């Protein structure tokens, strides 16, 4: 059917430490990249991280050559719409990635005001993003396929500014 | 016999590691030689 042995992920999603821990769940989690169950590999990126898992399928991510969790690229980091446009990947890339890719989700009780968890709340009790921007309006195939990619649109537009 | 027993246990059920990051490991989280 669909089996795997090791996750093809990026160094940003792998965690900011040489030693990590993986958890393999064979044939589960319903990977929507190929509509087939894959080995869901959960891990911990570090202290105060998101502790996410694998989302895309194994064979479905081999043709795209992107991360298992971030699903951007393999070496540069641009989206698939920006990678298929064009070196163009040398200038659009950026080393030392931000912690927002490994940051946890927001607290819905903090947005509602009744954050009864307190200082032991694992979620981030900060302000959410602006919904007027297209950066918080992506989808499943919108990030995987190059069609309707808002992150790739601003990457080619801001590349010619000065 | 061990290979046939592993296939029979798989049929009756249904019916550390260190990968060197040679993809993009240059400067982002440097020092990860074995990962």
């Amino acid at each position: 059917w669909e089996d795997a042995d090791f996750p093809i992920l990026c160094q940003t999603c792998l965690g900011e430490n040489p030693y990590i821990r993986m958890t393999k769940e064979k044939y589960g989690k319903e990977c929507k990249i190929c509509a087939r169950p894959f080995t869901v590999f959960r891990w911990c990126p570090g202290v105060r991280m998101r502790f996410k898992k694998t989302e895309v399928c194994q064979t479905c991510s081999k043709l795209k050559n992107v991360c298992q969790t971030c699903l951007l690229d393999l070496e540069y980091g641009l989206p698939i719409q920006v990678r298929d446009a064009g070196d163009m990947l040398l200038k659009l890339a950026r080393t030392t990635p931000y912690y927002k890719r490994n940051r946890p989700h927001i607290c819905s009780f903090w947005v509602k005001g009744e954050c009864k968890r307190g200082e032991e709340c694992p979620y981030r009790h900060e302000k959410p993003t602006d919904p007027d921007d297209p950066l918080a309006d992506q989808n499943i195939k919108d990030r995987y396929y190059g069609i309707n990619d808002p992150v790739a649109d601003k990457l080619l537009k801001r590349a010619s500014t000065m | 016999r061990v290979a046939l027993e592993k296939s029979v246990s798989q049929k009756v059920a249904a019916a550390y590691i260190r990968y060197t990051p040679s993809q993009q490991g240059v400067a982002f989280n440097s020092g990860a030689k074995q990962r």
Binding site: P18, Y19, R21 | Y16, I17, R18, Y19, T20, S22, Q34
Partner: peptide, 18 residues
């Protein structure tokens, strides 16, 4: 390229977290 090791998981998780 995967390359497993036969080291102990207890001493490895204790040394990296320290």
């Amino acid at each position: 390229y995967a390359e497993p090791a036969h080291i102990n998981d207890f001493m490895f998780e204790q040394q990296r977290r320290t």
